[PDB]
Amino acid sequence: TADVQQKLAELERQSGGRLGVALINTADNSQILYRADERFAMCSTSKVMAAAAVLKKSESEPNLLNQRVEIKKSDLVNYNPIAEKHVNGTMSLAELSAAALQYSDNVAMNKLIAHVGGPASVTAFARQLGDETFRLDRTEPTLNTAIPGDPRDTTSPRAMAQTLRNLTLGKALGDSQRAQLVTWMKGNTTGAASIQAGLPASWVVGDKTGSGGYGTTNDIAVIWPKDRAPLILVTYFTQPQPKAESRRDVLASAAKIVTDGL
Ligand SMILES: *[B@@]1([O])O[C]([C]C([O])=O)[C][C][C]1[N]C(=O)[C]C1=[C][C]=[C]S1
Ligand SMILES: [Cl-]
């Protein structure tokens, strides 16, 4: 408890940056919190809320996920690993959700944002869930600038852990939609060096990463440990220098520290 706090503080100092952690353990309703009420730039971890907003919308529009969306050269941004393969064709909203969540595709994220009515609509959805901390201000790519002191496109680790718990394990979404979100997150391709890297190989993880300005390196996860109740873990990290390098190792270390001895 105090041991874990000290270990997180030592990791943070060694890292040179600012670390935010929230773990919810659904075994006993306990938490581990470190700067859990401070704001951090979400960066690509915000893609979970945008996909969830589309899933919510689909509850009253049962054919929504099949809807076709044109991909054009004008849609391309800075990071288009899936979308660049589909220029001059269409992708379904399901495909765009999967591309955003599993490959962190920024065009896909922009199409999800646009569909549901823009960043203020994704934010209003967060409010409807009871999350009064989340704010999505901008589209891709600018939502990742992560300037220190800038509250745009931020949330707290506590808020995001509670919200992710509600989305993946609770009743924010209908059963089909929740299952789809969990399926997409379990199939993520981008997370193996982050939270997953600090957990035993046998544990099952659905996570969403993000990388941004000021070396901002983030991951949010739902975790099914071997023969245990699930966990929700948010690890946010950001650094003082604009061109700081990614530090996914810091997220792995934080994950190890807060799950040790479970
Ligand atoms: B996102 O924050 O994270 C992605 C990688 C990941 O999931 O680990 C890549 C796309 C996103 N980040 C960016 O677009 C990078 C920046 C844009 C403006 C400043 S940094
Ligand atoms: Cl192992």
UniProtKB/TrEMBL annotation:
Which ranges does the record mark as transmembrane? none
Ordered alphabetically, the record's keywords are: Antibiotic resistance, Disulfide bond, Hydrolase, Plasmid, Signal
Q: Which GO terms describe its biological process?
A: beta-lactam antibiotic catabolic process; response to antibiotic
InterPro entries named in the record:
Beta-lactam/transpept-like, Beta-lactam_cat, Beta-lactam_class-A, Beta-lactam_class-A_AS, Cefotaximase
Q: Which residues form a coiled coil?
A: none
- State its Enzyme Commission number(s): 3.5.2.6
Catalytic activity from the UniProt record: a beta-lactam + H2O = a substituted beta-amino acid
Where is each Beta-lactamase class A catalytic domain found? 21-235
Q: Which PROSITE patterns match?
A: BETA_LACTAMASE_A
Gene Ontology molecular function terms on file: beta-lactamase activity
Similarity comment = Belongs to the class-A beta-lactamase family.
Matching entries from NCBIfam families are given as: bla_class_A, blaCTX-M
Protein name as catalogued: Beta-lactamase
Source species of the chain: Klebsiella pneumoniae subsp. pneumoniae
